Ligand binder design. Structure first.
Ligand SMILES: N[C@@]1(C(=O)Nc2cncc3ccccc23)CCOc2ccc(Cl)cc21
Ligand SMILES: N[C@@]1(C(=O)Nc2cncc3ccccc23)CCOc2ccc(Cl)cc21
Lengths: 306, 299
């Protein structure tokens, strides 16, 4: 019983974190095999940030300009290349702690754990979701650049995010591990803003199924809805449209609890209309959207508390 | 910017988790040096001394990854079983066993079959339970804090109470709360809100640019404590006021000034507003957790 925002154990990622310094800029790098991956803005000197020409800045650098530190050991850079917004530093030592890993690009609504780091040293771990507006609501201070997001389903680390910047509203933007930004963001200090964000509907439904599994049904009602009528109502509350793929994905939770997906949609519509009336759902007074259907299945019991 | 429920990095603890099997019962153990610590109910009105004397070392199957450790001795200390093994854990971090107080927070590395599954942050409630997330087989999972390079183990999971909350012991086997390790009628007592932690979280909200709840008013500690008693909030002591000193100096809001804000929030609610993305007053961040997250301390 219980339901917490649960991160993956961070040990496999901690053994990959390094400090990368280029001139006066210091940030974090991810050391996998003989390559250290880090944001390419480590080569910018703050003024450069308005309109940096990364190709022009990088050509003026040699391997010895990049100082990489793994614990109290200096790694030697023997090559460098830029792939999109990531710098790949070839080092002369393969990381003996390299876990089994993959680079994966995620879709909005997907969750992942973030190992926040400063100076190549891990500070904390928390759970995050890729917002529909492609930002993440993280907890990052200056120097956190290069911290990574990941999942560890079945002892393989799937790296999905590398931290690059903080937008004016306090939210965060970054890239996949191939250096492609999530969202329309650029690694420039030009005027940029997060678009209007929306609630991840499929995740809220998953969390309502988690509440039923843990024993709570107060919010259910005798009604159902069509998918189209649900979306027409949900769009009015700034909720993401629910697609047939989302209905399919919720199939297992629907079968475990005996509540049809469109019947859970009717409960959500009513919650949006009425609010919670002094009640809570899984210790929350707000509808939670940072648990996916997969996260609920991972954490919750396979037996509903009837 | 941002404020999340953040756990300590779990790597130093992951390298200590093992699977302990005795008969049909399988749970988790903590392997430090040449000893594996686990709940004594793995041997299971139980007379633990009588049940343990009937066991031999070879009855305890301990597995660290895909390697079987051999048990060469066993002893009980309160509600923890200490299994002496022939191999010292080469991954043993610098550590201490500490007993925490209600209101203090810690990270939990939830495990099943000696394999870590997740990490989350929680607080020892004033009623000595924790609002964890544990399923059958999670017994022996541990709670900890990290100070510099030293892991301070403070909790070992033993059981789930009927309300879905959890109970356990420190690493010396002393339960937190009036609980016993047996199948008998037990219940969590009425819980209260950790006042000093709510104030710490309000300071975190102010640091993050959430100031709508601030007001021109102040209060005495005695008048605030009358209000705290009314809403099932723990009393705020002069020690708590002292502990909040740094956050008070950073934000320019006196501790008693923040108390008048909390009093108004208790008497009037949030009125459709949120604080740090929450519609409830959050009490599972200590003042130290706020300072650490708003300063980027590393391990
Ligand atoms: N290094 C920058 C940044 O956002 N850095 C921070 C990241 N995360 C969190 C931060 C919190 C506070 C201050 C800074 C933070 C500094 C500001 O200009 C840009 C612009 C573009 C890019 Cl790609 C990076 C930055
Ligand atoms: N092994 C017991 C337990 O509570 N174990 C669980 C722990 N966490 C979570 C659980 C979730 C579901 C079921 C079981 C859980 C099962 C019930 O009887 C006792 C009695 C005394 C003690 Cl010390 C332990 C247990």
């Amino acid at each position: 019983s219980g339901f917490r925002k649960m991160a993956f154990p961070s040990g496999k990622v901690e053994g990959c974190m390094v400090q990368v310094t280029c001139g006066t800029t210091t940030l974090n790098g991810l050391w996998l095999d003989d390559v250290v991956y880090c944001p390419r803005h480590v080569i910018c000197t703050s003024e450069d940030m308005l309109n940096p020409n990364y190709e022009d800045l990088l050509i003026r650098k040699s391997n010895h300009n990049f100082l990489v530190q793994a614990g109290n050991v200096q790694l030697r850079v023997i090559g460098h290349s830029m792939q999109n917004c990531v710098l790949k530093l070839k080092v002369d030592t393969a990381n003996p702690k390299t876990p089994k890993y993959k680079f994966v690009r995620i879709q909005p609504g997907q969750t992942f754990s973030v190992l926040a780091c400063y100076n190549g040293s891990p500070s904390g771990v928390y759970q995050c979701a890729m917002r529909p507006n492609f930002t993440i609501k993280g907890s990052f201070l200056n120097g956190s650049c290069g911290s990574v997001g990941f999942n560890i389903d079945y002892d393989c680390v799937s790296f999905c995010y590398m931290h690059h910047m903080e937008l004016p509203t306090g939210v965060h933007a970054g890239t996949d591990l191939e250096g492609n930004f999530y969202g329309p963001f650029v690694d420039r200090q030009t005027a940029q803003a997060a678009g209007t964000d929306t609630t991840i509907t499929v995740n809220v439904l998953a969390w309502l199924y988690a509440a039923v599994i843990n024993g709570d049904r107060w919010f259910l009602n005798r009604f159902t809805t069509t998918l189209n009528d649900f979306n027409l109502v949900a769009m009015k509350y700034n909720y993401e449209p629910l697609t047939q793929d989302h209905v399919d994905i919720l199939g297992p939770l629907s079968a475990q609890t005996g509540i049809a997906v469109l019947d859970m949609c009717a409960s959500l519509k009513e919650l949006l209309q009425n609010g919670m009336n002094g009640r809570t759902i899984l210790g929350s007074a707000l509808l939670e959207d940072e648990f996916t259907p997969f996260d609920v299945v991972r954490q919750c019991s396979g037996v509903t508390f009837q």
